[PDB]
Design a protein around this motif. Structure first.
Motif, PDB file in Angstrom:
ATOM      1  N   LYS A   1      62.570 -26.077  30.596  1.00 14.33           N
ATOM      2  CA  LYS A   1      62.022 -25.795  29.248  1.00 14.33           C
ATOM      3  C   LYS A   1      61.546 -27.080  28.556  1.00 14.33           C
ATOM      4  O   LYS A   1      61.935 -28.159  28.979  1.00 14.33           O
ATOM      5  CB  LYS A   1      63.087 -25.096  28.388  1.00 14.33           C
ATOM      6  CG  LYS A   1      63.571 -23.743  28.928  1.00 14.33           C
ATOM      7  CD  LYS A   1      64.594 -23.133  27.968  1.00 14.33           C
ATOM      8  CE  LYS A   1      65.156 -21.829  28.534  1.00 14.33           C
ATOM      9  NZ  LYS A   1      66.135 -21.216  27.604  1.00 14.33           N
TER      10      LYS A   1
ATOM     11  N   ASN B   1      61.388 -22.749  18.440  1.00 16.74           N
ATOM     12  CA  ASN B   1      61.730 -24.094  18.890  1.00 16.74           C
ATOM     13  C   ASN B   1      60.572 -24.837  19.573  1.00 16.74           C
ATOM     14  O   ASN B   1      60.793 -25.807  20.294  1.00 16.74           O
ATOM     15  CB  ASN B   1      62.960 -24.026  19.778  1.00 16.74           C
ATOM     16  N   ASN B   2      59.332 -24.393  19.349  1.00 16.67           N
ATOM     17  CA  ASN B   2      58.092 -24.957  19.912  1.00 16.67           C
ATOM     18  C   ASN B   2      58.136 -25.101  21.447  1.00 16.67           C
ATOM     19  O   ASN B   2      57.830 -26.149  22.010  1.00 16.67           O
ATOM     20  CB  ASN B   2      57.723 -26.286  19.214  1.00 16.67           C
ATOM     21  CG  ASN B   2      57.874 -26.320  17.704  1.00 16.67           C
ATOM     22  OD1 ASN B   2      58.441 -27.281  17.210  1.00 16.67           O
ATOM     23  ND2 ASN B   2      57.350 -25.364  16.949  1.00 16.67           N
ATOM     24  N   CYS B   3      58.591 -24.064  22.145  1.00 15.97           N
ATOM     25  CA  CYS B   3      58.870 -24.079  23.581  1.00 15.97           C
ATOM     26  C   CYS B   3      57.595 -23.932  24.430  1.00 15.97           C
ATOM     27  O   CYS B   3      57.417 -22.941  25.133  1.00 15.97           O
ATOM     28  CB  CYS B   3      59.895 -22.979  23.866  1.00 15.97           C
ATOM     29  SG  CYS B   3      61.459 -23.165  22.976  1.00 15.97           S
ATOM     30  N   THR B   4      56.677 -24.899  24.345  1.00 20.53           N
ATOM     31  CA  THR B   4      55.292 -24.797  24.862  1.00 20.53           C
ATOM     32  C   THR B   4      55.143 -24.604  26.376  1.00 20.53           C
ATOM     33  O   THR B   4      54.071 -24.238  26.846  1.00 20.53           O
ATOM     34  CB  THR B   4      54.449 -26.009  24.434  1.00 20.53           C
ATOM     35  OG1 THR B   4      55.016 -27.210  24.898  1.00 20.53           O
ATOM     36  CG2 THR B   4      54.303 -26.128  22.922  1.00 20.53           C
TER      37      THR B   4
ATOM     38  N   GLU C   1      57.673 -23.296  30.089  1.00 20.01           N
ATOM     39  CA  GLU C   1      58.880 -22.867  30.784  1.00 20.01           C
ATOM     40  C   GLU C   1      58.577 -22.640  32.270  1.00 20.01           C
ATOM     41  O   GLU C   1      57.446 -22.314  32.628  1.00 20.01           O
ATOM     42  CB  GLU C   1      59.426 -21.617  30.084  1.00 20.01           C
ATOM     43  CG  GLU C   1      60.666 -20.985  30.729  1.00 20.01           C
ATOM     44  CD  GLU C   1      60.378 -19.784  31.643  1.00 20.01           C
ATOM     45  OE1 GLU C   1      59.289 -19.675  32.229  1.00 20.01           O
ATOM     46  OE2 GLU C   1      61.251 -18.902  31.742  1.00 20.01           O
TER      47      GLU C   1
ATOM     48  N   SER D   1      65.547 -32.632  17.649  1.00 21.83           N
ATOM     49  CA  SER D   1      64.492 -31.718  17.213  1.00 21.83           C
ATOM     50  C   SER D   1      63.312 -32.366  16.471  1.00 21.83           C
ATOM     51  O   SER D   1      62.287 -31.725  16.257  1.00 21.83           O
ATOM     52  CB  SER D   1      65.138 -30.585  16.408  1.00 21.83           C
ATOM     53  OG  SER D   1      64.303 -29.455  16.321  1.00 21.83           O
TER      54      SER D   1
ATOM     55  N   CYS E   1      61.366 -27.284  24.686  1.00 22.07           N
ATOM     56  CA  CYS E   1      61.540 -27.075  23.245  1.00 22.07           C
ATOM     57  C   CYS E   1      61.890 -28.366  22.472  1.00 22.07           C
ATOM     58  O   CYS E   1      62.371 -29.361  23.017  1.00 22.07           O
ATOM     59  CB  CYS E   1      62.617 -26.010  23.041  1.00 22.07           C
ATOM     60  SG  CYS E   1      62.488 -24.525  24.084  1.00 22.07           S
ATOM     61  N   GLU E   2      61.708 -28.341  21.157  1.00 22.17           N
ATOM     62  CA  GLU E   2      62.261 -29.321  20.225  1.00 22.17           C
ATOM     63  C   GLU E   2      63.759 -29.080  19.993  1.00 22.17           C
ATOM     64  O   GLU E   2      64.187 -28.737  18.897  1.00 22.17           O
ATOM     65  CB  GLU E   2      61.441 -29.290  18.939  1.00 22.17           C
ATOM     66  N   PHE E   3      64.556 -29.206  21.048  1.00 19.45           N
ATOM     67  CA  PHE E   3      66.003 -28.974  21.038  1.00 19.45           C
ATOM     68  C   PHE E   3      66.756 -29.876  20.056  1.00 19.45           C
ATOM     69  O   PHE E   3      66.349 -31.008  19.823  1.00 19.45           O
ATOM     70  CB  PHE E   3      66.548 -29.202  22.450  1.00 19.45           C
ATOM     71  CG  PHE E   3      65.995 -28.239  23.472  1.00 19.45           C
ATOM     72  CD1 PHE E   3      66.444 -26.910  23.463  1.00 19.45           C
ATOM     73  CD2 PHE E   3      65.058 -28.657  24.435  1.00 19.45           C
ATOM     74  CE1 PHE E   3      65.993 -26.012  24.436  1.00 19.45           C
ATOM     75  CE2 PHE E   3      64.588 -27.751  25.396  1.00 19.45           C
ATOM     76  CZ  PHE E   3      65.068 -26.433  25.405  1.00 19.45           C
TER      77      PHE E   3
ATOM     78  N   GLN F   1      59.608 -32.613  20.733  1.00 19.39           N
ATOM     79  CA  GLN F   1      59.915 -31.880  21.967  1.00 19.39           C
ATOM     80  C   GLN F   1      60.634 -32.746  23.021  1.00 19.39           C
ATOM     81  O   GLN F   1      60.439 -33.954  23.115  1.00 19.39           O
ATOM     82  CB  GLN F   1      58.633 -31.282  22.544  1.00 19.39           C
ATOM     83  CG  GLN F   1      58.138 -30.089  21.716  1.00 19.39           C
ATOM     84  CD  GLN F   1      56.914 -29.433  22.349  1.00 19.39           C
ATOM     85  OE1 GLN F   1      55.817 -29.441  21.810  1.00 19.39           O
ATOM     86  NE2 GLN F   1      57.038 -28.888  23.533  1.00 19.39           N
TER      87      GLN F   1
END
Ligand SMILES: *[C@@H]1O[C@H](CO)[C@@H](O[C@@H]2O[C@H](CO)[C@@H](O[C@@H]3O[C@H](CO)[C@@H](O)[C@H](O)[C@@H]3O)[C@H](O)[C@H]2NC(C)=O)[C@H](O)[C@H]1NC(C)=O
Ligand SMILES: *[C@@H]1O[C@H](CO)[C@@H](O[C@@H]2O[C@H](CO)[C@@H](O[C@@H]3O[C@H](CO)[C@@H](O)[C@H](O)[C@@H]3O)[C@H](O)[C@H]2NC(C)=O)[C@H](O)[C@H]1NC(C)=O
Ligand SMILES: *[C@@H]1O[C@H](CO)[C@@H](O[C@@H]2O[C@H](CO)[C@@H](O)[C@H](O)[C@H]2NC(C)=O)[C@H](O)[C@H]1NC(C)=O
Ligand SMILES: *[C@@H]1O[C@H](CO)[C@@H](O)[C@H](O)[C@H]1NC(C)=O
Ligand SMILES: *[C@@H]1O[C@H](CO)[C@@H](O)[C@H](O)[C@H]1NC(C)=O
Ligand SMILES: *[C@@H]1O[C@H](CO)[C@@H](O)[C@H](O)[C@H]1NC(C)=O
Ligand SMILES: *[C@@H]1O[C@H](CO)[C@@H](O)[C@H](O)[C@H]1NC(C)=O
Ligand SMILES: *[C@@H]1O[C@H](CO)[C@@H](O)[C@H](O)[C@H]1NC(C)=O
Ligand SMILES: *[C@@H]1O[C@H](CO)[C@@H](O)[C@H](O)[C@H]1NC(C)=O
Lengths: 232, 220, 525, 43
Positions: free
Chosen positions: C89, C101-104, C106, C72, C91-93, C75
């Protein structure tokens, strides 16, 4: 801010040798004249000398020109520390002080500027006077009797002797209670070392509730224990 | 030489009031090229190597002591104390950016004012180890008063040495910046029991008198 | 574990249909017959881009993760082959080995080999083919997506049996486009001399003959640097050892010129009280040059002598020799309290460019009277015997310093050891080149430094430190030519390195160059 | 403020005349004819 730290804490004797270490990084290592900062525990520390820690270019305060030595180590994230013919304040704790960087576009060793004033300090590595007693097992049982014990002035405590460190593992009170700092550390006294007479506030039930310990030594005295004492 | 040195060594500020810790050099610190004030205040814990927190004689560090922080004034300087008599009551001194021999003063203390109120004075012969008790005879202790303003007395051997006993002293013992210690009558090792009396006492500057009680030599 | 990749991992490089044509291209491709790494999972490098494949019959591999951290702190690209559809996806997983989760951005969309390429802005290609350990059979991967996301990918992982990884090298390929716009076969031009030949001819069939394919060139194995011996050091050696070091009220100087300015000795100077170089930094100044060093000296009480800078304003430097802003140059200092001080300390000399502040010992400073000629109470001379105490250290006590602003004051030119008989780079004085330096018989006159050829090019050098003449040959280079029977007859080939000596690369030295793979014969045909 | 460009505004197709054209940013000029080629689905 800076990577400031101190290390190698030990007993060192007046007129004899000493050893130490400190931690350094960034402008305090390679862009400023750092201070070696030290003092007797009765005051805030001051400059033993000024060091440019890359290559080490060095100047000393004239009370410590002989008594203390410092060495270059800035790329080792460090500064080296030593003493010989140590001062009367040989128990002085010390650490690196992280000097503020060169304020203008000159190049080479910046010792032409600043002083011991610094943006960080290594918190101070401890010391003790190695000319004093190196033990601390000595103990002397006493605290307030039934004029205050089991009543409005009860304290748990004992006297302590011959200690190298000021802290004592007996803690004056025996662990049931120790209200206020009056279960105090030992201090330089007629025992040839640190000596004490401490008694903190204790349980109001009895002199055995207000139970005590008297051993003057901590771990640096090689004798740190809860050696017993009692009131009256 | 620069002579960077502190003035009060300790304060005694009123609660919710203000005072200053003070310091100075001997001469010229507002140095002639710019008047660029080559000093700043260190503040930290007691006994520490110095770190600056009232920076460049007119500014302050990130999260600096603020109400306890301060500024320069010609050859002199001060750190404040506005409601800072506890928690912000640091060890403090000015130090120089002026020269190689320039360094911080001995960490003079911001602190709250405390009264010389009476110690926990009582009788106290040594315990059963009185045949080796030494300085332990006539044991007494103090709290809730100024740090050197209350102490035990040399009442053993009937010597009646009001507030004048041999002692250990340390940190805080009440909110008035009051501090705590304990002490007893001076004796040789077996003399803690072997004195002509084992009476004990304590004294303080704000008491109507020293306070005390009797006991037998090494009585337990 | 490792296995031979054979010909797998070609993909349609670009979005265009081509007829039955041989197309040459540059792209990131799996090199033919290289090692796949075989796995049976750990995080791995992505490097330039990843070929990937597996035979997971029950869709055992479920997906992938890509990024720098794969956690995290930034990204990371996630891909999952979910049972209904592909899901993607960014995200910053933050997960372990595989989440179960900043999922910019998809997006949604052992009988078999499932096969892919991942590339980077990011792109994917695939194929999905029946199999019987990789097949020796060939088939290119169709494009499958392009994503606008521009994620920093340096490492990747896998989410869930046998699977494979290999790295896309930059490579030149010839591709056999076909009647339906499909790719049917491919070459990898770098693979072997026959594959260079196929690419050079733009053809999968090659006739019997000799064909040019490349230029062989020996690379320079190191760089050699030579200059004359150092001599005639700068007068700094006297200046910073002068017990008579100049008083700031009477500062003095000289032009350091026609000399080796050994400023590296000052750069390393562990004994120096300070260095104050407002010009070049001393590590560069050890290799500087100037018409002369404007070298000048002064001394005072240390804290006052610290005013000595170009464009400075301190009253003590005003009272001695304060430099203009144009006086940027080198500077250095020493502890005068240890030796230069008198019995009165700094009272040994008149205290704080040389005399450039109109400074002299006469009346100077003060407007209290019309400056009648008494140097004291009428109109004070400021630069009287210096105030610094003899018992202090050189900040409170006296200190001394000197400086010089910048064709004849030259820093030392370091030289390497010499090398012979190897293709190397060489610098000698201002002459630079690349060649095999060789000891030689070619005598030439004492003032002369170079050889020449008739074409007016460098041919030899006098070594400046042991005066032998080194004859210079260029680093060996020549054509590469591939002898081949027709591919119709055999895939075996022989390489001719034209005009090289076989030392420089079965093998045969011909009169035309070094021939490789061919067998010499004493019969004639 | 390449994931958010404005509208890709487009004309009708004009076969068999000589025409100037933009398709997707490929540009040229020619006679657009109906044709029997078999591009792969992505091409
Ligand atoms: C001013 O004079 C001094 C003294 O000559 C110059 O510096 C010192 O020069 C000596 C050689 O005369 C150096 O000593 C040698 O050092 C090497 C390396 O550590 C050692 O292996 C040898 O046994 C020998 O001791 C010395 O290092 C050098 N530096 C110092 C600080 O003493 C100086 O260069 C002169 N000033 C200028 C600006 O040139
Ligand atoms: C540049 O500087 C180097 C080092 O100072 C000089 O190297 C020296 O070269 C001479 C020959 O020109 C050497 O002399 C020979 O020594 C051997 C014994 O080792 C002896 O058998 C020969 O008869 C002859 O005397 C010398 O040893 C060597 N080293 C030194 C330290 O001088 C070089 O000559 C200089 N070049 C120029 C052009 O200034
Ligand atoms: C390449 O093109 C030919 C012609 O399209 C393909 O062969 C078959 O040709 C007949 C007659 O035109 C059609 O009825 C078939 O449907 C074609 N088969 C296919 C699969 O399209 C030939 O197979 C194509 N080859 C490849 C590899 O695409
Ligand atoms: C993997 O590569 C190395 C070096 O190219 C080679 O020695 C090895 O044989 C290769 N692995 C296999 C299975 O061939
Ligand atoms: C979204 O990005 C910001 C970047 O500063 C980060 O602080 C925030 O925690 C992220 N949100 C989530 C839920 O990860
Ligand atoms: C990530 O991408 C940005 C934008 O191109 C670039 O500036 C940065 O250096 C990259 N960092 C890494 C570690 O890939
Ligand atoms: C060479 O090519 C011809 C067709 O051009 C072919 O019939 C022949 O079998 C091939 N091989 C040899 C050895 O001639
Ligand atoms: C090739 O190189 C070697 C070593 O440099 C040399 O002995 C030989 O004479 C050269 N020429 C030929 C024709 O072998
Ligand atoms: C070719 O002839 C030479 C000279 O007689 C001899 O040395 C060599 O061994 C022969 N080589 C072969 C391959 O027959």
């Amino acid at each position: 801010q800076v990577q400031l730290v101190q290390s190698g804490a030990e007993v060192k004797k007046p007129g004899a040798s000493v050893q130490v270490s400190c931690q350094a990084s960034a402008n305090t290592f390679t862009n400023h004249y750092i201070h070696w900062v030290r003092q007797a525990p009765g005051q805030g520390l001051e400059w033993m000398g000024i060091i440019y820690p890359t290559g080490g270019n060095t100047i000393y305060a004239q009370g410590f020109q002989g008594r203390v030595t410092m060495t270059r180590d800035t790329s080792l994230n460090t500064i080296y520390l030593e003493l010989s013919s140590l001062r009367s304040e040989d128990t002085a704790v010390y650490y690196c002080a992280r000097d503020v960087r060169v304020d203008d576009s000159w190049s080479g060793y910046d010792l032409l500027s600043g002083g011991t004033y610094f943006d960080y300090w290594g918190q101070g590595t401890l010391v003790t006077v190695s000319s004093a007693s190196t033990k601390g097992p000595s103990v002397f049982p006493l605290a307030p009797s039934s004029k205050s014990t089991s009543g409005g002035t009860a304290a748990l405590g004992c006297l302590v002797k011959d200690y190298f460190p000021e802290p004592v593992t007996v803690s004056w009170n025996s662990g049931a209670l120790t209200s206020g700092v009056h279960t105090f550390p030992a201090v330089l006294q007629s025992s040839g070392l640190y000596s004490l007479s401490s008694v903190v506030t204790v349980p109001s039930s009895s002199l055995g509730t207000q139970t005590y310990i008297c051993n003057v030594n901590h771990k640096p005295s090689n004798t740190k224990v809860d050696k017993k004492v009692e009131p009256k | 030489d620069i002579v960077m040195t502190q003035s009060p060594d300790s304060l005694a500020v009123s609660l919710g009031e203000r005072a200053t810790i003070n310091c100075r050099s001997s001469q010229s610190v507002l140095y002639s090229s710019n008047n660029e004030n080559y000093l700043a205040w260190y503040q930290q814990k007691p006994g520490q190597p110095p770190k600056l927190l009232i920076y460049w004689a007119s500014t302050r560090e990130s999260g600096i002591p603020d109400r306890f922080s301060g500024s320069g004034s010609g050859t002199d300087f001060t750190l404040t104390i506005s409601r800072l008599q506890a928690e912000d009551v640091a060890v403090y001194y000015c130090q120089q950016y002026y020269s190689l021999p320039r360094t911080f003063g001995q960490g003079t203390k911001v602190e709250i004012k405390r009264t010389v109120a009476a110690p926990s004075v009582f009788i106290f012969p040594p315990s059963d180890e009185q045949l080796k008790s030494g300085t332990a005879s006539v044991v007494c202790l103090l709290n809730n008063f100024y740090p050197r303003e209350a102490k035990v007395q040399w009442k053993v051997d009937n010597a009646l040495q009001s507030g004048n006993s041999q002692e250990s002293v340390t940190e805080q013992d009440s909110k008035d910046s009051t501090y705590s210690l304990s002490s007893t009558l001076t004796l040789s090792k077996a003399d803690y029991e072997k004195h002509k009396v084992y009476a004990c006492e304590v004294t303080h500057q704000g008491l109507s008198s020293p306070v005390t009680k009797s006991f037998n030599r090494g009585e337990c | 574990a490792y296995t031979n990749s054979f010909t797998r991992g070609v993909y349609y490089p670009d979005k265009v249909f081509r007829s039955s044509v041989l197309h040459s291209t540059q792209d990131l491709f799996l090199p033919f017959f290289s090692n796949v790494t075989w796995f049976h999972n750990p995080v791995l490098p992505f490097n330039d881009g990843v070929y990937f494949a597996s035979t997971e019959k029950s869709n055992i591999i479920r997906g992938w993760i890509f990024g720098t951290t794969l956690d995290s702190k930034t990204q990371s690209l996630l891909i999952v082959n979910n049972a209904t559809n592909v899901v993607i996806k960014v995200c910053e997983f933050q997960f372990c080995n595989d989440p179960f989760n900043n999922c910019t951005f998809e997006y949604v969309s052992f009988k078999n080999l499932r096969e892919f390429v991942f590339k980077n802005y990011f792109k994917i290609y695939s194929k999905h083919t029946p199999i019987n350990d990789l097949p020796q059979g060939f088939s290119a991967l169709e494009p499958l997506v392009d994503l606008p996301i521009g994620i920093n990918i340096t490492r990747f992982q896998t989410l869930l049996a046998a699977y494979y990884v290999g790295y896309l090298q930059p490579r030149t390929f010839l591709l056999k486009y076909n009647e339906n716009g499909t790719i049917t076969d491919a070459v990898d031009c770098a693979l072997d001399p026959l594959s260079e030949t196929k690419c050079t001819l733009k053809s999968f069939t090659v006739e019997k003959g000799i064909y040019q394919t490349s230029n062989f060139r020996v690379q320079p194995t190191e760089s050699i640097v030579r200059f004359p011996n150092i001599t005639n050091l700068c007068p700094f050696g006297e200046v910073f050892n002068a017990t008579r070091f100049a008083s700031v009220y009477a500062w003095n100087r000289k032009r350091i010129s026609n000399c080796v300015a050994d400023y590296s000795v000052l750069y390393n100077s562990a004994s120096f009280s300070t260095f104050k170089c407002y010009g070049v930094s001393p590590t560069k100044l050890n290799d500087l040059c100037f018409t002369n060093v404007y070298a000048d000296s002064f001394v005072i009480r240390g804290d006052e002598v610290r005013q000595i800078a170009p464009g400075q304003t301190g009253k003590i430097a005003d009272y001695n020799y304060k430099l203009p802003d144009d006086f940027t140059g080198c500077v250095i200092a020493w502890n005068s309290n240890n030796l230069d001080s008198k019995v009165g300390g700094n009272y040994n000399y008149l205290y704080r460019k040389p005399f450039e502040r109109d400074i002299s010992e006469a009346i100077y400073q003060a407007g209290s009277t019309p400056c009648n000629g008494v140097e004291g109470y009428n109109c004070y001379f400021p630069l009287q015997s210096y105030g610094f105490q003899p018992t202090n250290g050189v900040g409170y006590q006296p200190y001394r310093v000197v400086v010089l602003s910048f064709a004849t004051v030259c820093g030392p030119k370091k030289s390497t050891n010499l090398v012979k008989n190897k293709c190397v780079n060489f610098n000698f004085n201002g002459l630079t080149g690349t060649g095999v330096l060789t000891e030689s018989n070619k005598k030439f006159l004492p003032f002369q430094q170079f050889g020449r050829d008739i074409a007016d090019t460098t041919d030899a050098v006098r070594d400046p430190q042991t005066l032998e003449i080194l004859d210079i040959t260029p680093c060996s280079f020549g054509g590469v030519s591939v002898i081949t029977p027709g591919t119709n007859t055999s895939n075996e080939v022989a390489v001719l390195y034209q005009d090289v000596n076989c030392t420089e690369v079965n093998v045969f030295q011909t009169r035309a160059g070094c021939l490789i793979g061919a067998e010499h014969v004493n019969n004639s045909y």
